[PDB]
Paper text:
Human blood pressure is mainly controlled by the renin–angiotensin system, which consists of several key components, including renin, angiotensinogen (AGT),3 angiotensin-converting enzyme (ACE), and angiotensin receptors. Renin is a highly specific aspartic protease that cleaves AGT between Leu10 and Val11 to release the N-terminal angiotensin I peptide. Cleavage of AGT by renin is the rate-limiting step of the renin–angiotensin system. To address these questions, here we have solved high-resolution crystal structures of human glycosylated AGT, its encounter complex with renin, AGT cleaved in the reactive center loop, and the spent AGT from which the N-terminal angiotensin peptide has been removed by renin.
Subsequently, we prepared spent AGT, where the N-terminal 10-residue angiotensin I peptide was removed from the AGT-N14 expression construct and loop-cleaved AGT, where AGT-N14 was cleaved between Gln412 and Leu413 by thermolysin treatment. To confirm conclusions from biochemical experiments that cleavage of the reactive center loop of AGT does not trigger the stressed-to-relaxed (S-to-R) transition characteristic of inhibitory serpins, we solved the structure of AGT cleaved by thermolysin treatment and compared it with that of intact AGT. Loop cleavage indeed induces no significant conformational changes, with an r.m.s. deviation of only 0.28 Å over 371 Cα atoms. The cleaved loop is disordered, but is not inserted into the central β-sheet A. In contrast, it has been shown that AGT has lost the ability to undergo this typical serpin S-to-R transition, confirmed here by our structure of loop-cleaved AGT, so it was very puzzling why the serpin framework was selected in the course of evolution as an angiotensin carrier.
Numbering used by the authors: 1 to 21, 30 to 402, 417 to 450
């Protein structure tokens, strides 16, 4: 039947798919076993290929999971007193990644675990039929679509250069047998999946093995020491995402400028500077200014500066809600000279912490049923999201971000927030 309880009909199973009625397993090679580094340029070529053969229906599904990811992102802010206390390193977040990580857990979940994970993703069910449940395959492929759509815009635009890499590291205990169809499912989300076996009895060394392995294979830094891992841990599900967006007609100024973290304190920071006609709007009631700088026609960097420095947290509350996507319309063109810090940010967080008030720890530790992932004993050490975020260089209103500000990168193709962030200090 047609769906009414939610407007997300394209992400659930259908009649043919549902009620279809002895699963190959394997031990991933040891982490030390030498692997080829990821060819990012070859990965970017794969993602454009995904996007360039998306039918109309597939395009709508991409926009749908974009919306769901966004909503979860806003839920995650609404449930935290100090959200950024959880995030190690730079204060950046990825709704798309977080949604993909939960969707990957759901992929290998059953019974009450699956129900609770589907609940957090934010798509309910009106009965315990098969057709009311989430189609992980459609969700995971749809998330690769929004990645594809973003990077394809970058190619089509002669000026712009967008780059988005997502790699998943599934690290298991020695002897833990992974199910083949689970790995087959992750491959829908991203082409770079790295299942490797790893001894967790020495967490101090295990962390170094991962950091070295991930740094060798990617070339990015992480520094995630499995802070909340135990000796009984037999699984670490880590998502590493890299973003690099070229700023149209911006130059890196040779001389630095002062960035005011406090009323009293400043810090010397390298700054980007650029002229152009950008979308701008002042909210006089709530007291903040939004400035949009396009990467492409449909993908942009939103820059929210509060009118007063003390209202940052207050204005952040107005940024991270459903309303924020309404004021995309209230923008209008302005000739602007923007000056903002060169952002080269690395941050990481555990979802277990992010979604503590949605009782994700309870789901992943009490009465766990991840039998679609593995029949062995699964005890989750960390569910990590590592983010590496770069902004590189190539009458009139002077916009200057020499004090704390919020940012987001948004793609209208799939109506998706790839990154929400906050810059209290542009270095560390």
């Amino acid at each position: 039947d047609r769906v009414y309880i939610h407007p997300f009909h394209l992400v659930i199973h259908n009649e043919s798919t549902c009620e279809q009625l002895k699963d190959p397993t394997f031990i991933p090679a040891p982490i030390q076993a030498k692997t080829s580094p990821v060819d990012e340029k070859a990965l970017q070529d794969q993602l454009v290929l995904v996007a360039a053969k998306l039918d109309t229906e597939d395009k709508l599904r991409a926009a749908m999971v974009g919306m769901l990811a966004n909503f979860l992102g806003f839920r995650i802010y609404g449930m935290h007193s100090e959200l950024w206390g959880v995030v190690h390193g730079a204060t950046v977040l990825s709704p798309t990644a977080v949604f993909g990580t939960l969707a990957s857990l759901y992929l290998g979940a059953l019974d009450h675990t699956a129900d609770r994970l589907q609940a957090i993703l934010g798509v309910p069910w009106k009965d315990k039929q098969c057709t009311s449940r989430l189609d992980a395959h459609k969700v995971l492929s749809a998330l690769q679509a929004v990645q594809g759509l973003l990077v394809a815009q970058g190619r089509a635009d002669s000026q712009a250069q967008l780059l988005l890499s997502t790699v998943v590291g599934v690290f298991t205990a020695p002897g833990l047998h992974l199910k083949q169809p689970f790995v087959q499912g992750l491959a829908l989300y991203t082409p770079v999946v790295l299942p490797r076996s790893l001894d967790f009895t020495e967490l101090d060394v295990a962390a170094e093995k991962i950091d070295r392995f991930m740094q060798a294979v990617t070339g990015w830094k992480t520094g995630s020491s499995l802070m909340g891992a135990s000796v009984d841990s037999t699984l670490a599900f880590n998502t590493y995402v890299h973003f690099q967006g070229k700023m149209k007609g911006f130059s890196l100024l040779a001389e630095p400028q002062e960035f005011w973290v406090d009323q009293s304190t400043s810090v010397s920071v390298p700054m980007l500077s650029g002229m152009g006609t950008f979308q701008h709007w002042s909210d006089i009631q709530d007291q903040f200014s939004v400035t949009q700088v396009p990467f492409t026609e449909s993908a942009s960097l939103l820059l929210i500066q509060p009118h007063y420095a003390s209202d940052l947290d207050k204005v952040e509350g107005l940024t991270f809600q459903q309303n924020s996507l309404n004021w995309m319309k209230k923008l209008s063109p302005r000739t602007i000279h923007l000056t903002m810090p060169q952002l080269v940010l690395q941050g990481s967080y555990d979802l277990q912490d992010l979604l503590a008030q949605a009782e994700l720890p309870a789901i992943l530790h009490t009465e766990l049923n991840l039998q679609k992932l593995s029949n062995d004993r699964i005890r989750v050490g960390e569910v990590l999201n590592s983010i590496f975020f770069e902004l590189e260089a190539d009458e009139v209103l002077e916009v200057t971000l020499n004090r704390p500000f919020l940012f987001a990168v948004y793609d209208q193709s799939a109506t998706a927030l790839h990154f929400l962030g906050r810059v209290a200090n542009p270095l560390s």
